[PDB]
Amino acid sequence: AVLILSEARSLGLTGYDFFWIVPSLVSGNTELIPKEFPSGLISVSYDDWDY
Amino acid sequence: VNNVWNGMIGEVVYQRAVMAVGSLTINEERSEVVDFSVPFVETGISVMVS
Amino acid sequence: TQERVNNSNKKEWNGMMGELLSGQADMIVAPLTINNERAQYIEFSKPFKYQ
Amino acid sequence: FVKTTVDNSFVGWDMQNVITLDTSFEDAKTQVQLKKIHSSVILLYCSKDE
Amino acid sequence: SQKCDLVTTGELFFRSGFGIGMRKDSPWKQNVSLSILKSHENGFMEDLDKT
Structure with missing residues (x-):
């Protein structure tokens, strides 16, 4: 996913009017984030803060 | 009223939404604060009786 | 209206609009219909009639 | 020349991005x-090596 | 109406008013059009058309 997003950034698919959506498999450990994930990356994940 | 507007024109003037579509109308005091564009229907005023 | 020059692919304006465009006048006060082709490079005013 | 001869034609071409x-x-x-x-009609202009 | 020997078949199609054409780079625009509106509501234009 990181490679795909980095490659597609140059092509212009991640501008101001695109909303990437991705399952919990790529959300990872919710602590380490590489310098390839654009902001606005809605991704359903299991709860780890509420209870 | 009291040197302030309200509704459509009021929200347009105070940089809140750059558009106003609907049943507006061209006037002389209105056009001095905003800028309309190419009227497309013929309005006016008329009398209706039973 | 707008016509084409003789034996060429260029575009030319004849009559009222051509006279106005070539620095020969500033107002066209006369019966003049509002059209998309005209309004490309002339700033109109609010209409004073409807027909 | 291309810019000045594409804005005078009577066919109505479609100028896309010009790249250097x-x-x-x-x-x-x-x-x-x-x-x-x-x-689909790319119109490159190089000498030979470029 | 004046030469009472003809008729006007049909009602209307492609309606568009007249106007006062001026060049794009002119300072008279913002003061002319407004004036027309101010002359379109105190019965001046209707009186002139009636006359």
Whole structure:
């Protein structure tokens, strides 16, 4: 996913009017984030803060 | 009223939404604060009786 | 209206609009219909009639 | 010349983006600029090596 | 109406008013059009048309 997003950034698919959506498999450990994930990356994940 | 507007024109003037579509109308005091564009229907005023 | 020059692919304006465009006048006060082709490079005013 | 003869024609062409490649095969500005081509009649102009 | 020997078949199609053409780079625009509106509500234009 990181490679795909980095490659597609140059092509212009991640501008101001695109909303990437991705399952919990790529959300990872919710602590380490590489310098390839654009902001606005809605991704359903299991709860780890509420209870 | 009291040197302030309200509704459509009021929200347009105070940089809140750059558009106003609907049943507006061209006037002389209105056009001095905003800028309309190419009227497309013929309005006016008329009398209706039973 | 707008016509084409003789034996060429260029575009030319004849009559009222051509006279106005070539620095020969500033107002066209006369019966003049509002059209998309005209309004490309002339700033109109609010209409004073409807027909 | 292309710009001045495409704005006078009576057929109505469609000017897309015009691209210049200052440094050939620099893979820092050639790739990003070249990757966005939504056309089919590319009209390059180089000497022989470029 | 004046030469009472003809008729006007049909009602209307492609309606568009007249106007006062001026060049794009002219300072008279913002003061001319407004004036027309100010002259379109105090019965001046209707009176002139009636006359």
